[PDB]
A paper describes a structure:
To understand how a N-terminally extended 10-mer peptide is presented by HLA-B*0801, we determined the X-ray crystal structure of (R(N-Me)A)AAKKKYCL covalently bound to HLA-B*0801E76C at 1.65 Å. The structure surprisingly shows that the peptide adopts an elongated conformation in which the AAKKKYCL core is bound into the groove, and the residue extensions P−1 (N-Me)Ala (one position N-terminal of P1) and P−2 Arg protrude out at the A pocket. The electron density was well-defined over the entire length of the peptide, including the extension P−1 (N-Me)Ala, although no electron density at an acceptable 1σ threshold could be discerned for the N-methyl group of P−1 (N-Me)Ala and P−2 Arg. The P−2 Arg residue was therefore omitted in our model. Comparisons with a previously reported canonical structure of GGKKKYKL bound to HLA-B*0801 (42) showed that the peptide backbones adopt nearly identical conformations, except for a small 0.71-Å shift in P1 Cα-atom positions. Remarkably, only minor structural changes in the binding groove were detected between the two structures (r.m.s. deviation of 0.46 Å, over 1–180 Cα positions), except for residue Arg62. In the canonical structure of GGKKKYKL, the side chain of Arg62 acts as a lid atop of the peptide N terminus, whereas in our structure, this residue swings out and up, which “opens” the A pocket. In this “open” configuration, P−1 (N-Me)Ala and P−2 Arg can extend straight out of the groove. A close-up view of the A pocket shows that the side-chain methyl group of P1 Ala is rotated and occupies the position of a canonical N-terminal group of bound peptide structures. In our structure, because of the lack of a peptide N-terminal group, there are noticeable changes to the conventional network of H-bonds normally seen within the A pocket: H-bonds to conserved Tyr7 and Tyr171 residues are absent, and a new H-bond is formed between the main-chain nitrogen of P1 Ala and Asn63.
Author numbering:
A (entry chain C): 1 to 9
B (entry chain B): 0 to 99
C (entry chain A): 1 to 275
Write the structure that this text describes.
């Protein structure tokens, strides 16, 4: 996917 | 919280020619936070079918939006953009000037 | 020339008005190609570019699921940030992020980006090494500690050096008739008397892509930086951009001023004068 999995800050 | 006031530009998509169809743009940039109210006016009246771009922001985190609608400039008609934001005491009105 | 792919995500709380809105918009250079908005009636990865429509339903579905999960992650993040800054549940706050890659003419990685801002201030950023973090304050040091324990930077590095560069190269090829075409500015100078003693010269650049451009006025060869009014580069709504630069000139001295335009679309830099 071009989107990246994000991480909770 | 830091807040940044919008810069406002009002202009046409293509150079303006009386009686020829065009798009009227109101570009709001440099503002924070992102809630903003934008109206396009024709002789002081709010125009109804106005579209806008998807909210995005520049590298320095300030937001921008383009509001646009089709129009036909004429010698008579006056156009403008009215903007409100948390940073403004009252709505700001910037008139369309075909030389800016 | 060089190219970038970047996502710009905004999550904003609105207490009393539902959960925080999440919008994510992806660009190649100055061309938007995808949007996801959690407030859209049926949230989906939505094409903003005809060359993306070419990707199959599995691409759409995969990204759609990443955006939906990202919406929940950004809400997690906003709840944690409110607590890191001892803020009350009454106020609206905004978390922004930008991530993606830049590549050169050969398609090789120039550099990766992953960074965040809270309430308009930088909060944490992955360093250019793609291995360590720069935290703005003691709250972002808590996120840095959590992300160091969980080896987040490695996952980000792998995305930026792999997935991001591979997709950018693929988008550039599928979109080559537009993404790889620089449109030069159409330029002209206009003159507007102010008084008997002065007039404005305005140097216009219209119809150009990408948005990066340099417009300057020189008087007798000297840059008039301080005395030039430069408007923010603005979109026309048909993919191209516009900009002008104006200087106030003493009457009769117009020919001493020259407008200089540099743009990647032009075969060579332009020097223009009034008439």
């Amino acid at each position: 996917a071009a989107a990246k999995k994000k991480y909770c800050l | 919280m830091i807040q940044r006031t919008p810069k406002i530009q009002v202009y046409s998509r293509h150079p303006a020619e009386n009686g020829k169809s065009n798009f009227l743009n109101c570009y709001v940039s440099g503002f924070h936070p992102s809630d903003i109210e934008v109206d396009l006016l024709k002789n002081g009246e709010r125009i109804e079918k106005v579209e806008h771009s998807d909210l995005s922001f520049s590298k320095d985190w300030s937001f921008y939006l383009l509001y646009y609608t089709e129009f036909t400039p004429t010698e008579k008609d006056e156009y403008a953009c009215r903007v409100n934001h948390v940073t403004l005491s009252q709505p700001k009105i910037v008139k369309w000037d075909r030389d800016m | 020339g060089s190219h970038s792919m970047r996502y710009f995500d905004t999550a904003m709380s609105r207490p009393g008005r539902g959960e925080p809105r999440f919008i994510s918009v992806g660009y190649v250079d100055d061309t938007q190609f995808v949007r996801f908005d959690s407030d859209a009636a049926s949230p989906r990865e939505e094409p903003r570019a005809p060359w993306i429509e070419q990707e199959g339903p599995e691409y759409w579905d995969r990204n759609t699921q990443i955006f939906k999960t990202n919406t929940q992650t950004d809400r997690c993040s906003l709840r944690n940030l409110r607590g890191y800054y001892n803020q009350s549940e009454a106020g609206s706050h905004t978390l922004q992020s930008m991530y993606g890659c830049d590549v050169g003419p050969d398609g090789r990685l120039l550099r990766g980006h992953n960074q965040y801002a809270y309430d308009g201030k930088d909060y944490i950023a992955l360093n250019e090494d793609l291995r360590s973090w720069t935290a703005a304050d003691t709250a972002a040091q808590i996120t840095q500690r959590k992300w160091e324990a969980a080896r987040v930077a490695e996952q980000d590095r792998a995305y930026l050096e792999g997935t991001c560069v591979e997709w950018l190269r693929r988008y550039l090829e599928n979109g080559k008739d537009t993404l790889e075409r620089a449109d030069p500015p159409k330029t002209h100078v206009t003159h507007h008397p102010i008084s008997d003693h002065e007039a404005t010269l305005r140097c216009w650049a219209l119809g150009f892509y990408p948005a990066e451009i340099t417009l300057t006025w020189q008087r007798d060869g000297e840059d008039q930086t301080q005395d030039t009014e430069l408007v923010e580069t603005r979109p026309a709504g048909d993919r191209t951009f516009q900009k002008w630069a104006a200087v106030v000139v003493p009457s009769g001295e117009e020919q001493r001023y020259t407008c200089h335009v540099q743009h990647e679309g032009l075969p060579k830099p332009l020097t223009l004068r009034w008439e």
